[PDB]
């Protein structure tokens, strides 16, 4: 089951944080579905698992990212021996979708974070904020700041040629 699964209302249409999650996988179990949500970025924090999309089978580990986009038919399953933990951010909006088309990550939907990547700290920080989300303390502003930082970081580290 899920250590964290915060679902937010879809009140913004340029940029919206839809949900933030942490899941420790159960060995040999996962998910097989057509993605309904706009976009969901997963960061693998430990263990191993497999991501299956368009006939390709990726063996992923700590440091790896995979992104689910609306309409993708996907399967992602924790390793029997050493099941992954992943953090995820679900997001949407017209700006979000324009910025995703500026990164090479949306071609294969998988990447590996370099040693000094800014992406892991942003995703971990959004999940931390989500645990005690308080809009009256302006956590809503902070999550949006962090989502703009995340998409900037994806384009910096995984650019499409100009």
Ligand X SMILES: OC[C@H]1O[C@@H](O[C@@H]2[C@@H](CO)O[C@](O)(CO)[C@H]2O)[C@H](O)[C@@H](O)[C@H]1O
Provide the binding-site residues for its own copies, judged by CB under 8 A: 12-15, 95, 99, 102, 136-138, 141-142, 144-145, 148-149, 151-152, 155-156, 162
* 68: helix, strand or coil: strand
Q: Interhelix angle for 119-131 vs 139-157, to 10°?
A: 160
- Please tell me whether residue 64 adopts helix, strand or coil conformation: strand
Residue 97 CB, shortest distance to its own copies, in Å, is 13
- The count of residues interacting with ligand X (CB under 6 A) is 9
Q: How far is the CB of 64 from its own copies (least distance, A)?
A: 24
CB of 1 to ligand X, least distance (A): 9
Enter the tokens of residue 73.
């038919």
17: how many CB neighbours lie within 10 A of its CB?
27
Q: By CB under 6 A, name the binding residues for ligand X.
A: 21, 23, 31, 33, 36-37, 40, 88, 90
């Amino acid at each position: 089951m899920q250590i964290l699964w915060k679902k937010y209302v879809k009140e913004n249409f340029e940029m919206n944080v839809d949900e933030c999650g942490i899941e420790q996988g159960i060995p040999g179990l996962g998910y097989n579905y057509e993605v309904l949500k706009n976009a969901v970025i997963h960061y693998v924090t430990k263990g191993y698992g497999t991501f299956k999309f368009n006939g390709k089978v990726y063996n992923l580990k700590q440091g790896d990212i995979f992104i689910l986009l609306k309409g993708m038919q996907v399967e992602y399953v924790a390793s029997i021996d050493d099941p992954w933990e992943y953090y995820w951010i679900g997001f949407s909006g017209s700006n979000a979708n324009e910025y995703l088309n500026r990164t090479s990550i949306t071609n294969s939907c998988v990447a590996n974070c370099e040693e000094n990547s800014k992406i892991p700290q942003i995703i971990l920080n959004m999940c931390e904020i989500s645990k005690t989300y308080n809009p009256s303390r302006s956590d809503d502003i902070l999550l949006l700041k962090e989502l703009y930082s995340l998409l900037y970081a994806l384009i910096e580290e995984f650019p499409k040629p100009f």
